Structure formats: C-alpha cells, structure tokens
Design an enzyme around this catalytic site. Sequence first.
Site, PDB file in Angstrom:
ATOM      1  N   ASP A  35      50.047  24.329  38.441  1.00 34.23           N
ATOM      2  CA  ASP A  35      50.278  25.571  39.365  1.00 34.23           C
ATOM      3  C   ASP A  35      50.087  26.996  38.813  1.00 34.23           C
ATOM      4  OD1 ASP A  35      51.491  26.892  41.344  1.00 34.23           O
ATOM      5  OD2 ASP A  35      53.637  26.490  40.743  1.00 34.23           O
ATOM      6  N   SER A 199      41.149  40.582  48.158  1.00 32.59           N
ATOM      7  CA  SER A 199      39.835  40.100  49.106  1.00 32.59           C
ATOM      8  C   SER A 199      39.472  41.416  49.865  1.00 32.59           C
ATOM      9  CB  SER A 199      40.372  38.887  50.062  1.00 32.59           C
ATOM     10  OG  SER A 199      39.375  38.871  50.810  1.00 32.59           O
TER      11      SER A 199
END
Length: 330
Positions: A35, A199
């Site tokens: 994770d 992004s």
Amino acid sequence: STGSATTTPIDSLDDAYITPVQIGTPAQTLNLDFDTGSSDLWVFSSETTASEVDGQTIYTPSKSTTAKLLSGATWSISYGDGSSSSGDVYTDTVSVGGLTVTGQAVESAKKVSSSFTEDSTIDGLLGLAFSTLNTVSPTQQKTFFDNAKASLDSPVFTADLGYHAPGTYNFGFIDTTAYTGSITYTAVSTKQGFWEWTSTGYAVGSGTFKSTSIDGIADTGTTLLYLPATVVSAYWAQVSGAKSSSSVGGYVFPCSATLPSFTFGVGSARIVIPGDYIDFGPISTGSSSCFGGIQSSAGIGINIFGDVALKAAFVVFNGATTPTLGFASK
C-alpha cells in the site's frame, strides 16, 4: 541488493493485490497488501481477537527466533474506507522477493475491523508511503522500503500491476523490459506523507486533451480512480445510461454500454487507461447495473490515483533525497 516479487489480484475485479512476504525465523509467509498510501506493516497474528480471524494466515511471533517485542509500542490506524486495526509491535526479519530487512517493525493486530475479517485473502498490509505517516507510538517506525533503501542498488521501487492478471513489485532496480517508450518523471510533495504529485490533465476516449492541474496521490492500496467531480462528470457523460446513484454510492452504468478510455497527463506524456479497466461489474449478483471505476473524490479531500490508474502504467517510486514519481506506458 534488489528484490522482486509477484503481486496477484485477490479476485476477478482486481479489488486489491496480494504479495507474499516472509516474516520471522523460520519464515512465516503471509500475503500482504502493498500500500503506497500508508506506512504501517501490520499482520493478522496469534494475538488477534479470535472472533475477528476467518481464514487469514497469522504471524505467531513466539514461533520466530528473531522476533523481539518492541516494548511499550502500540499502533492504531484507520483507512479511507472506514476500516481499522490496532495492536502491539515486534521487530523481526522481513523478506520480500529475496530482499531481506532485519529489525523491521512488524505490527501485530490485536483488533481488526469487520472488512478485514471478512476478506480471507489479505493477511495484512505493507505500507510504502513515507514513514512520517507511521502510526507506532511512542517511537514512530520506518517502512520496509525506508529500512532497505541504503542497501538497495538504487533507492527505488516499482509497481507493475496487472489487469486481471499478476504483476510485479521490484525493489532497487528498474526493469527496462517491463515498459514501452520512456519513463516520464514528475515532482513529488511529501508534505502529507504521500506519493503526491500533479497530473497535467485528462482526456475522455478520443476527445481532446484538457490541460488542467490535478493534485493527487499514487496509491496502490486504493482500488479505484478518484478525481474531481467535474472530471468524473465529463467522463460518465460519454457513457450511455450512466448515472450517479446515491443509494449505491457512485456512478453506475448499464453493463451493455461500451466504456471509453481515460487518459491522464504526466508532464507532456500521456497514460491511457483502457475502457475495460473502468468496469467493476454488477453492483449485486445478477444485476444489470455495473459499478464504475472512476468516481468523485469530493469529500475525500484528496484525489487518488488508485489501481485503476496505476495498473495502466509502469510506476517508479523514486526514493532519492528528493523523491519523484515516474510513469511509463507498458
């Protein structure tokens, strides 16, 4: 040194991925959920409340000759899906795919919430976010990657998650045969303890690319792609019959519809998520209503590039002095 381990979907939807991990002496092999969104290595154990264990493989520290109680240490974590666990701590030898760390904090669960009990395929989590998120008290502990870092050939690990198929986690090296084209690296903020990046925009199917900054985290422990409500609306507006369902808790769509791809920007580069990756099947057995793999982050408070996005890429988690993230098509 290096390590390399295969990671396997737990079910037919890629809800999560498990990776075998050797703990203790003699080795006890547990299948852990790697994770990159958390920083605790915790396991089902001999100490876990008996009624809360159902099919998981447990770590028994008393059977490990290298296990040492971390005296006075406790841990307690809550995850974004409301689940949680807590317990005490041992240090022991931990190996992943041939890479060995001695003195790793192995957090032993005394309590786990229902969703962990109810998932027989996950024996625990191995956190790979920054060690500043680690919940051990009074002395915060380091992640497996943090402890391994200085011994690694290169201070990196990579995630190569498969679509409905096994993939690979590598430590200490970049497998240049595992991706096409070039790796585009992008800046990371560690201020919230996550692999947090920005992004450069998105496109829906064959649509034109929309240049817009989307701050989010690369999170292998989250199943879906969570983006701003504007972006998610623009996506599902291109799916005939799709709607946001309050009762179900997100966007659903007729199983008969064709899903467009979703492209996200990494600098000037582009990662394309095929439409099929965004299908998470019937909301209930036999239903003609299917759950969407792109959902709104509104109210999470952060955008999450989970497995839906990351499995479309070869992802480098670069733990150099100044961390960065790299993305390649594959």
